[PDB]
Design an enzyme around this catalytic site. Structure first.
Site, PDB file in Angstrom:
ATOM      1  N   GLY A  24       0.786  -1.230   0.000  1.00 46.97           N
ATOM      2  CA  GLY A  24       0.000   0.000   0.000  1.00 46.97           C
ATOM      3  C   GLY A  24       0.815   1.275   0.000  1.00 46.97           C
ATOM      4  O   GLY A  24       2.030   1.271   0.216  1.00 46.97           O
ATOM      5  N   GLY A  26       1.212   5.477   1.157  1.00 53.44           N
ATOM      6  CA  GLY A  26       0.889   6.413   2.215  1.00 53.44           C
ATOM      7  C   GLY A  26       1.642   7.699   2.035  1.00 53.44           C
ATOM      8  O   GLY A  26       2.731   7.868   2.587  1.00 53.44           O
ATOM      9  N   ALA A  29       5.146   7.677   0.467  1.00 56.41           N
ATOM     10  CA  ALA A  29       5.711   6.368   0.725  1.00 56.41           C
ATOM     11  C   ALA A  29       4.957   5.258   0.025  1.00 56.41           C
ATOM     12  O   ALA A  29       3.733   5.298  -0.137  1.00 56.41           O
ATOM     13  CB  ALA A  29       5.617   6.077   2.205  1.00 56.41           C
ATOM     14  N   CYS A  31       4.858   0.952   0.671  1.00 62.37           N
ATOM     15  CA  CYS A  31       5.186  -0.053   1.671  1.00 62.37           C
ATOM     16  C   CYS A  31       5.163  -1.427   1.042  1.00 62.37           C
ATOM     17  O   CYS A  31       4.249  -1.760   0.281  1.00 62.37           O
ATOM     18  CB  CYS A  31       4.276   0.033   2.891  1.00 62.37           C
ATOM     19  SG  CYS A  31       3.818   1.703   3.443  1.00 62.37           S
ATOM     20  N   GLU A  95       8.564  -3.836  11.905  1.00 58.62           N
ATOM     21  CA  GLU A  95       7.798  -5.053  12.204  1.00 58.62           C
ATOM     22  C   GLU A  95       6.644  -5.289  11.229  1.00 58.62           C
ATOM     23  O   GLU A  95       5.821  -4.392  11.012  1.00 58.62           O
ATOM     24  CB  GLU A  95       7.350  -5.054  13.682  1.00 58.62           C
ATOM     25  CG  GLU A  95       6.307  -6.114  14.108  1.00 58.62           C
ATOM     26  CD  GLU A  95       5.967  -5.988  15.597  1.00 58.62           C
ATOM     27  OE1 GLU A  95       6.471  -5.060  16.267  1.00 58.62           O
ATOM     28  OE2 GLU A  95       5.184  -6.818  16.106  1.00 58.62           O
ATOM     29  N   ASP A 140      -2.169  11.017  14.768  1.00 57.88           N
ATOM     30  CA  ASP A 140      -2.928  10.479  13.640  1.00 57.88           C
ATOM     31  C   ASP A 140      -3.374   9.047  13.887  1.00 57.88           C
ATOM     32  O   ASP A 140      -3.217   8.190  13.011  1.00 57.88           O
ATOM     33  CB  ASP A 140      -2.207  10.700  12.307  1.00 57.88           C
ATOM     34  CG  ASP A 140      -3.015  10.398  11.049  1.00 57.88           C
ATOM     35  OD1 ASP A 140      -4.262  10.474  11.091  1.00 57.88           O
ATOM     36  OD2 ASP A 140      -2.406  10.081  10.006  1.00 57.88           O
ATOM     37  N   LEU A 143      -7.951   3.801  12.301  1.00 55.07           N
ATOM     38  CA  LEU A 143      -8.052   2.350  12.155  1.00 55.07           C
ATOM     39  C   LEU A 143      -7.002   1.736  11.232  1.00 55.07           C
ATOM     40  O   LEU A 143      -6.583   0.596  11.414  1.00 55.07           O
ATOM     41  CB  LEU A 143      -9.448   1.948  11.689  1.00 55.07           C
ATOM     42  CG  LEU A 143     -10.591   2.205  12.668  1.00 55.07           C
ATOM     43  CD1 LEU A 143     -11.916   2.016  11.958  1.00 55.07           C
ATOM     44  CD2 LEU A 143     -10.546   1.297  13.880  1.00 55.07           C
ATOM     45  N   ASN A 145      -3.793   2.519  10.902  1.00 54.66           N
ATOM     46  CA  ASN A 145      -2.433   2.451  11.451  1.00 54.66           C
ATOM     47  C   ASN A 145      -2.335   1.740  12.794  1.00 54.66           C
ATOM     48  O   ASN A 145      -1.303   1.784  13.472  1.00 54.66           O
ATOM     49  CB  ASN A 145      -1.644   3.755  11.381  1.00 54.66           C
ATOM     50  CG  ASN A 145      -2.276   4.938  12.086  1.00 54.66           C
ATOM     51  OD1 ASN A 145      -3.054   4.792  13.025  1.00 54.66           O
ATOM     52  ND2 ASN A 145      -1.957   6.132  11.629  1.00 54.66           N
TER      53      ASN A 145
END
Ligand SMILES: C=CCn1c(=O)c2cnc(Nc3ccc(N4CCN(C)CC4)cc3)nc2n1-c1cccc(C(C)(C)O)n1
Ligand SMILES: [Zn+2]
Length: 294
Positions: A24, A26, A29, A31, A95, A140, A143, A145
């Site tokens: 995804g 963001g 960024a 990921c 992680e 921020d 749901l 993050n």
């Protein structure tokens, strides 16, 4: 543009990471799941291109993120595993929480059962207690993050609107970025501190128990006009103990809200069944927490 390399090398720690599955976007960024080419251990890799960091202020936010996030170690925080660079990209190794986030759960399940909300909100509050103890505000919490590991434990990530608090009493006058559950003291530009995360947790608590967010309309600015007025309604089927805790957290005055240390002593937690764990079937089917099987 610059294409992202398939193997990401850090010269200082001497590791090579294979870049794998995309997860995804963001902001600037992207990921990916990434994995160490020797030891096979799998991480979430945040990759930002330096083409989007041409102005110093955007670099400073990337530095501040890394600075905050690398100082954190907790059960309910996504663990930071390093950072590295090349000439075109910034790489952060984090992680990997394999069961996605509370947003993916919310879209599948809608409103959760009270014990599940109580389960997840406890771990949210425990991780936010770590942050506020260390003088970090997240700013921020949403749901998407609050990431779920393979055991279904909450992991707060996404420290990219986060800030350190440097002195007691400090009000931050500025929040650069647009948080999802934005607090009224941020919206009005009055100035803010720790209370913004408790506001966020109240909106998360609303969303998990009710199934929809508290202030939402078709227009983000009419939504902000509602937050300014305190225009929300908890529906009458929500238990009064839970609705009381929502009302404490979603007050327009910051200083009327409870501090994060108080939350788990609320009657909502201290007179409710809090599961020790949830099984993987809770991602799909509502649990019916039965005292014996059959
Ligand atoms: C590494 C960058 C920041 N961030 C984390 O710290 C993080 C930790 N764990 C995860 N796990 C994860 C696992 C799987 C998936 N996907 C699996 C396949 N689904 C269809 C789509 C989503 C998805 C996630 N994912 C994580 N990240 C992440 C991954 C995707 C999107 C976003 C934001 C919130 C920036 O939009 N953050
Ligand atoms: Zn700015």
């Amino acid at each position: 543009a610059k294409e992202i390399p398939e193997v990401l090398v850090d010269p200082r720690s001497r590791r090579r990471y294979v870049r794998g599955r995309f997860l995804g976007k963001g902001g600037f960024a992207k990921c990916f799941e990434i994995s160490d080419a020797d030891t096979k251990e799998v991480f979430a890799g945040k990759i930002v291109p330096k083409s989007l960091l041409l102005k110093p202020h955007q670099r400073e936010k990337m530095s501040m993120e890394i600075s905050i996030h690398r100082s954190l170690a907790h059960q309910h925080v996504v663990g930071f595993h390093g950072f590295f660079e090349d000439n075109d990209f910034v790489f952060v190794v984090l992680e990997l929480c394999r069961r996605r986030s509370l947003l993916e759960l919310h879209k599948r399940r809608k409103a959760l059962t009270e014990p599940e909300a109580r389960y997840y909100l406890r771990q949210i509050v425990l991780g936010c207690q770590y942050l506020h103890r260390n003088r970090v505000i997240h700013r921020d919490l949403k749901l998407g993050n609050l990431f779920l590991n393979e055991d279904l434990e909450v992991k707060i990530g996404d420290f990219g609107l986060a800030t350190k608090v440097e002195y007691d009493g400090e009000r931050k006058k500025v929040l650069c970025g647009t948080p999802n559950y934005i607090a009224p003291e941020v919206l009005s530009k009055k100035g803010h501190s720790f209370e913004v995360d408790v506001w966020s947790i109240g909106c998360i608590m609303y969303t998990l128990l009710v199934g929809k967010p508290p202030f939402e309309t078709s227009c983000l600015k009419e939504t902000y006009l509602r937050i300014k007025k305190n225009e929300y309604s908890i529906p009458k089927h929500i238990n009064p103990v839970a609705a009381s805790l929502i009302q404490k957290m979603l007050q327009t005055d910051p200083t009327a809200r409870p501090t994060i240390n108080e939350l788990l002593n609320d009657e909502f937690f201290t007179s409710g069944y809090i599961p020790a764990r949830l099984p993987i079937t809770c991602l799909t089917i509502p649990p019916r927490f039965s005292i014996a099987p059959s």
